Nucleic acid binder design. Structure first.
Ligand SMILES: Nc1ccn([C@H]2C[C@H](O)[C@@H](COP(=O)(O)OP(=O)(O)OP(=O)(O)O)O2)c(=O)n1
Ligand SMILES: [Ca+2]
Lengths: 922, 376, 384
DNA sequence: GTCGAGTCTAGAGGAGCT
DNA sequence: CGGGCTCCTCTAGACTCGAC
């Protein structure tokens, strides 16, 4: 089964090759082989021996069509056929007029012609345009919603709106949500938010309803980069302003339809009001929501045909429909995780706040005698003082003495006529001190300067932080720094003479992003190595400084993410909603809690069509020194289920390599870059990541960043900054970029795609946004456009993987469902009986996707090196590595001990073949 | 000035200079706390009581007698009680009573009654503060919580109690890093850990948790298992006895070292004296009447007032302020002649030393709010 | 009877034989259970306030349980003997050494106060009069009996000694009658010391007899004399511009006997302890379902109450179910001031079913007003 | 009337992921 | 020209409203 190409690269096994590409094909010819051989000889890669990998023989599923592209097209058409049929119902539909007055009942109301209000259980429509309004005061619970469907207007009123009660259960349940559900298409402007509030979406078993998003299609069609939205808002080559807008509903409406400007409620009662206001201003809010739904439908009417014109391959839509059905399960350990993480966060915050407040209290004593003018850290604060503004005894004898004193006290307690109406806030304290303390009438008042924190601009002055013997100073123009007295004998970020501190030089703190950026806080993670090095030091001395930095690192993720994580809309399934497998499993906890979190992913939320999510796509990996980092590990499969998933090995590196190879000749490894990518293994430490990591001396995770940054338009400044940071030099950068070159063909292919009249992805031909085409921008945003070629090819890869995985799961009846897909990972919640079938399906999916990537480029083959995953994880909790134990500060005993989660197994292709007998059927 | 000298000066410590030595203070053979020291110890005992009984689910009070039954155990070193009239030697060791060395024996004696009180539902605990006698005779005030964990969750509850005790000891501390814990084992190899405080001479085990088994409970009950078997969940289980014993005399000494211008920055919920009242120039009679009324108002709300207006000895403001600082007075209230005109009184805070004016009507509410919000 | 009621409600403790009147008075065992300990703690706290917080120049005193010992013939208190010393021997010389050097247990708190006199004298700038108060355990032979004596040692000049004694007598009578359901059961009496010194005793009309719960003595300077045989200047206090050796007035009571007195006086079978003395003041239970949400409401209410110093009995945590009348009877036996019941209606509008022990009349109150009402009721009971 | 306190809103830097 | 996002806290600024 061994096969080798003309370049002696080991290719796909003959048994697999005869099924993927079939017998026959066209050889590249003698000239192409000569090109590749000379190119490899020039770079010295020709003479290297190749270690043969074991042969793989599989009975692959019968690919449909005449080739692989036809196979993928047929799969995607079958997948997304009902949802295009449902989507075309909205474009041609006509709506009856909006009712004069809305209903005040419970449940769903159907408004026929002339405003006839009829209560119904569910809309029961294949196509809906949806918007959900949530009273933020009552927590994360749907308040009211308006739906547009062909020939109907729908409104929904929650029981927490019609009925008035002292309190409701804080734990959400399916009975508290919107009942909205053989395929059905639900359209919304942020349809992830509208999906999260549906009761049928939390069931463990999958459902056929798919959600399409108007802002997703807006980003696909005419989206704007983050550097472009800034310019667009500031304004509101510039020919792109007329064909693009921010993802706001009104901004999109004024662009795609251009009718009368949309109106919003100025008060914002759903975000800035109470339930009483909503119950008293009900009609205005319902009308302003119906207006938004109508605007969304009108935008969709103009958006659907244009997206299909610019993204013609069925795989794009078939993958966009599937990427919006993410599903994260949780258990009662989620509440314990929240409680323990919050408790540890409060404990560490109090530990640092005690020291901070002690320094603040010992600081204000310098007011006496004006000693602050001598302090090297606090001489710049506000030390003003405010005046106070204005507009044995006998039993009978002792009783009289008591009464007289009490009356004398009571007399003065009535002398409040001179008291000003507004109580003055701490007139006797210094100016900087008042801002640190909440006012006495604050409902959340706590004694002392409770508002002080490490992020504040006074802390590095209170703690008397010192960088290499110099006190820290803040300049509004240049950020943090330090004052070197003597005003030039110090070497650093250069003395910025803008500050003009008398007798001192302002040197900026070294920053990881170079002298173009300004330091915001000296307590950044980057300074901990400099803290331990003895450069950054604290005034009180000892371990106070290092302990403060360590606590800041431990709680920094939780400080920014506790609002999101705590407010994650967890819905706990009752016992009647769980499947029989969870009920009957031995690990089932009869007195436990089971639920799920639906990520609010807005698919294609980037000009590169990447999905984005506030929390889950940015959730930190479990680390032994981060509070709450076990967040993903808290996503634990229910009893009887496993989280079978995999990671693509060097996804974008191999995509760029195959593009460069195909542009060169019809083989794999034609270019030096492609040959380097193919001849390597992560397990042996010789892949293109480690190959450069060893050369430069960094970790594999930093090697990824280095290589990807160098590929994606680093230029000369990035290389010179890296050289200066690593060796305290543009000639070396020129040498690196020169080494016709190793990666010249990939760059040529990317620039040919980018500068084309209508740039398209090489695989599926999805067009770029109208705001980035050469007709709209003359040679502008080049780095964003060239990066889009590979980064959106990665989204095409993800769409192909999702299509193939759904096809395999539905064809072989695997009892697993899509769980979550970070930008290159694909986690599947699979029942235990199907975990190895799922692993084999993932391996086959990766093989097919790599073969399709080769086929669309005309290579007609695939190497054995990249044909399969390194290993497919079979885990019970969502974590990066199956053998990793968290042992985070909020969970010191680990998943094995506290939460009782064992380790998993990472299985390569051969073990999966042995376990499944090389077959997916039972 | 040394901490011991300052505490003796401000009546936190008692005794002779020979009794103020480190070894003498650690021994416990003499009265070491003055009036303010006794008040601080009572405050610490009340904080421990609240945090370990009032806010803890199913923890109950118990009061044990100071003397254990007179059994002739050879290993016991406890002092014996002998009636002088009987004298006016084997029988003494045979039957004479002995002073208790730990509160565990009383907790185990009262274990049945507290089972009956809680309907025998495990888990539950007995908490007690009292004097325990140790051979050196030294006396220590032991605050011991004996938690009867079910055998299934012994280590889990042990870890929870270790974390809770460390948090409680660090809560009142100006330097939580000084309190630390380290796992230790006894002569019989029982698992456990000891809390410490980094005293200037070294770590002292202010609190120890011992993972005792069913043997320690069977010692006092050599009879039917059914009478001592707790109702853990659905199956009757002999509880796992954890001995969480904390020394509040050494705890108060630790907090006096931790709090320590010369100021004892004791926690607002620990300080013995919280409000100090003074007077202005004249007229004296009206100022004294106002101070008496204000003090009577404050005392009725539960705020420990120190009347400084009745002091006959004249002293400057600086001396008065330093005296109130060393005694850890939270606030000093000054009533002057201006108070009779508009009701404004000058208020000073120990933490910041900043003086601010406030109307006399709002003083009591401000103090109550400050003391209530300082606990959290 | 009261013995059964107090034992079954954990006011009393010990074996039934230990529940005899003589055993209770002797104090040779733990005679008070957790509720009895709470009631005695409340009584001690009220005494401390009435005679050390709301009093002038009265200070805390706390001293060792043991005494140095002087081999006096009248010292019948038990002695401390080290087991190691006995084991070393294993006889006249040994017994002589024991009687000469072994420390004895304290029988009264007077000597501890006299030992602490010097430091408290310095604290008050030697200004007479001033008092020393202490609550502690005293050891007396019946094994060994222990009494939780609460005593005040008042140092007053020779002038107005009898006046101060009468002042203290009337104030103690008023304080004991303040919490009394039947204040006529408390009576004062005249008495004379064995040395001819005058004094007074405070009785309580127990069903068996008028036990002395508190005793007053005009001891004079004789006690201060021995405790300090040294120079007079370290003994005499300041009276105005003069210096005089103060006369020592002994005002000593028994809070174990006082607690028994207040258990008998505060006696369906319902105890009517004073609100300032009752151990449990609020009982929080729960009605029908939803139990999961009503339990959260009760947890919130309980956390709100405990943060304001109100003792609460978490009855909602008990899995045993019984009729509401039985629960009310049990709470009355345990002297619960108010019984709070949270039901389904509480979720709808915040109204709870509030019951008062003194009236047996039910009420509906909003949740937000419960804390304020309880605090106001307790303050009104305390001030009046 | 003029001053002074609340109240959104914009930008900047840091921290997560890929 | 590393990219592409997400959200947070912190602070400067303009605007509004009430109080004397
Ligand atoms: N600093 C980074 C990190 C990642 N990526 C992109 C390129 C990758 O294809 C994709 C996924 O990131 P990975 O961390 O998975 O990178 P690799 O796939 O190369 O890692 P591995 O080979 O270990 O799977 O994200 C990037 O452009 N820049
Ligand atoms: Ca990867």
């Amino acid at each position: 089964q061994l096969r080798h190409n003309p370049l002696d690269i080991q290719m796909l096994s003959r048994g697999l090759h005869e099924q993927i590409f079939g017998q026959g094909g066209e050889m590249p010819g003698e000239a192409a082989v000569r090109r590749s051989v000379e190119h490899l000889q020039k770079h010295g890669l020709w003479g290297q021996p190749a270690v043969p990998l074991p042969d793989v023989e599989l009975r692959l599923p019968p690919l449909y069509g005449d080739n692989l592209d036809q196979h993928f097209r047929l799969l995607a058409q079958k997948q997304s056929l009902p949802y295009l049929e449902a989507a075309n119902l909205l474009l041609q539909a006509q709506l009856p007029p909006k009712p004069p007055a809305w209903a005040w009942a419970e449940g769903w109301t159907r408004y026929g012609p002339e405003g006839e209000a009829v209560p119904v259980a569910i809309p029961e429509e294949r196509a809906l345009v949806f918007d959900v309004e949530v009273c933020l005061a009552e927590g994360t619970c749907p308040t009211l919603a308006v739906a547009i469907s062909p020939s109907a207007w729908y409104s929904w009123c929650s029981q927490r709106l019609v009925e008035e009660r002292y309190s409701w259960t804080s734990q959400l349940s399916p009975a508290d949500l919107i009942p909205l559900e053989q395929e059905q298409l639900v359209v919304g402007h942020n349809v992830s938010f509208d999906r999260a509030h549906i009761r049928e979406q939390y069931l463990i078993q999958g459902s056929r309803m798919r959600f399409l998003d108007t802002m997703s299609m807006h980003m696909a069609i005419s989206g704007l980069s983050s550097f472009q939205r800034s310019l667009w808002i500031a304004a509101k080559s510039w020919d792109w302003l007329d064909i693009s807008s921010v993802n706001s509903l009104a901004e999109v409406h004024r662009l795609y339809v251009g009718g009368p400007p949309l109106e919003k409620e100025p008060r914002e009662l759903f975000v800035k009001g109470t339930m009483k206001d909503i119950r008293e201003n009900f009609q205005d809010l319902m009308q302003y929501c119906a207006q938004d739904v109508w605007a969304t439908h009108e935008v969709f009417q103009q958006q659907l045909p244009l997206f299909l014109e610019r993204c013609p391959h069925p795989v794009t839509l078939a993958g966009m429909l599937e990427m919006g059905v993410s599903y994260l399960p949780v258990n009662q350990n989620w509440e314990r995780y929240l409680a323990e993480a919050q408790g540890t966060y409060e404990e560490l915050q109090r530990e640092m706040k005690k020291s901070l407040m002690d320094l603040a209290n010992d600081a204000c004593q310098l007011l006496s005698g004006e000693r602050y003018k001598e302090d090297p850290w606090l001489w710049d604060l506000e030390w003003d003082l405010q005046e106070f503004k204005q507009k044995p005894c006998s039993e009978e004898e002792e009783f009289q003495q008591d009464v007289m004193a009490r009356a004398c006290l009571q007399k003065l307690k009535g002398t409040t006529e001179l008291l000003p109406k507004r109580p003055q806030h701490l007139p006797g304290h210094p100016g900087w001190y008042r801002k640190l303390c909440p006012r006495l009438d604050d409902p959340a008042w706590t004694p002392g300067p409770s508002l002080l924190s490490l992020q504040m601009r006074v802390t590095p002055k209170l703690m008397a932080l010192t960088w290499d013997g110099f006190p820290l100073h803040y300049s509004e123009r240049h950020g943090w720094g330090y004052l070197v007295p003597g005003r030039s004998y110090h070497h650093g970020n250069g003395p910025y003479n803008d500050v003009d501190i008398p007798g001192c030089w302002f040197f900026k703190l070294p920053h990881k992003d170079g002298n173009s950026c300004n330091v915001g806080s000296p307590f950044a993670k980057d300074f901990l190595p400099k803290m331990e090095d003895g450069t950054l030091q604290a005034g009180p001395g000892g371990a106070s400084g290092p302990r403060a930095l360590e606590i800041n690192k431990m709680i920094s993720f939780w400080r920014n993410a506790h609002k999101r994580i705590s407010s994650q809309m967890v819905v706990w399934l009752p016992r009647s909603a769980l499947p029989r497998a969870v009920i009957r499993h031995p690990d089932y906890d009869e007195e436990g809690l089971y639920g799920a979190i639906l990520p609010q992913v807005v698919t294609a939320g980037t000009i590169t069509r990447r999905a984005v999510e506030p929390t889950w796509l940015t959730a930190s990996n479990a680390r032994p020194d981060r509070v709450g980092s076990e967040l993903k590990a808290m996503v634990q499969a229910p009893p009887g289920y496993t989280l079978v998933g995999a990671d693509v090995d060097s996804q974008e590196l191999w995509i760029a390599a195959v593009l460069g190879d195909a542009h060169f000749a019809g083989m794999h490894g034609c270019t030096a870059f492609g040959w380097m990518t193919l001849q390597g293994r992560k397990s042996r430490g010789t892949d293109l990541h480690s190959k450069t990591a060893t050369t430069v001396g960094i970790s594999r995770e930093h090697a990824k960043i280095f290589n990807y940054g160098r590929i994606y338009g680093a230029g000369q400044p990035f290389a010179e900054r890296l050289l200066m940071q690593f060796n305290h030099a543009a000639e070396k950068a020129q040498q690196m970029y020169a080494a016709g070159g190793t990666e010249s063909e990939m760059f040529n292919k990317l620039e040919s795609i980018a500068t084309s009249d209508i740039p398209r992805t090489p695989v599926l031909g999805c067009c770029i946004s109208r705001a980035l085409e050469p007709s709209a921008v003359q040679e502008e945003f080049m780095t964003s456009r060239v990066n889009w070629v590979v980064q959106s090819s990665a989204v095409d890869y993800l769409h192909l993987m999702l299509v193939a995985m759904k096809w395999l799961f539905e064809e072989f009846a695997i009892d697993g469902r899509f769980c979550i897909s970070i930008h290159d990972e694909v986690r599947y919640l699979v029942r235990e009986e199907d975990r190895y079938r799922a692993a084999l399906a993932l391996q086959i999916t990766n093989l097919l996707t790599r073969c399709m990537f080769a086929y669309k480029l005309g290579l007609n083959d695939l190497p054995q090196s990249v044909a399969f995953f390194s290993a497919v994880d079979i885990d019970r909790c969502l974590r990066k590595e199956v053998t990793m134990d968290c042992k985070t500060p909020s969970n010191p005993t680990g998943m094995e001990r506290r939460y009782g989660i064992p380790q998993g197994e990472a299985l390569d292709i051969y073990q999966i073949i042995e376990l499944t007998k090389g077959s997916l059927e039972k | 000035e040394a901490l011991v000298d300052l505490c003796r000066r401000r009546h936190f410590f008692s005794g002779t200079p020979q009794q103020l030595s480190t070894a003498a203070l650690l021994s416990g053979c003499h009265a070491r706390f003055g009036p303010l020291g006794v008040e601080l110890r009572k405050n610490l005992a009340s904080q421990w009581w609240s945090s370990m009984v009032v806010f803890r689910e199913q923890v109950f009070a118990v009061d044990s007698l100071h003397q254990e039954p007179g059994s002739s155990q050879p290993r016991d070193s406890a002092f014996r009680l002998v009636s002088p009239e009987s004298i006016r030697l084997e029988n003494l060791l045979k039957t004479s009573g002995k002073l208790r060395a730990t509160l565990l024996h009383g907790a185990l004696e009262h274990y049945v009654n507290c089972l009956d009180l809680v309907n025998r539902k495990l888990p539950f605990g007995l908490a007690q503060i009292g004097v325990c006698f140790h051979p050196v005779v030294g006396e220590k005030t032991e605050a011991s919580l004996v938690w009867f964990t079910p055998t299934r969750t012994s280590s889990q509850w042990l870890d929870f109690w270790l974390r809770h005790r460390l948090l409680w000891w660090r809560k009142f501390a100006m330097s939580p890093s000084n309190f630390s814990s380290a796992d230790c084992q006894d002569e019989l190899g029982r698992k456990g850990s000891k809390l410490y405080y980094s005293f200037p001479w070294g770590k002292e085990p202010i609190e120890t948790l011992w993972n005792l088994g069913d043997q320690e409970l069977l010692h006092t009950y050599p009879g039917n298992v059914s009478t001592i078997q707790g109702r853990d969940g659905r199956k009757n289980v002999v509880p796992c006895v954890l001995s969480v014993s904390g020394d509040v005399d050494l705890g108060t000494l630790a907090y006096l070292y931790d709090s320590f211008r010369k100021v004892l920055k004791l926690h607002p919920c620990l300080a013995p004296i919280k409000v100090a009242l003074d007077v202005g120039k004249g007229p004296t009679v009206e100022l004294r009447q106002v101070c008496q009324g204000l003090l009577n108002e404050l005392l009725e709300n539960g705020i420990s007032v120190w009347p400084g207006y009745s002091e006959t000895v004249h002293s400057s403001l600086e001396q008065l302020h330093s005296k109130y600082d060393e005694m850890s007075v939270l606030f000093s209230v000054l009533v002057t002649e201006t108070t009779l005109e508009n009701g404004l009184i000058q208020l000073r805070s120990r933490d910041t030393t900043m003086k601010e004016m406030m109307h006399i009507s709002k003083l009591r509410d401000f103090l109550v709010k400050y003391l209530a919000s300082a606990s959290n």
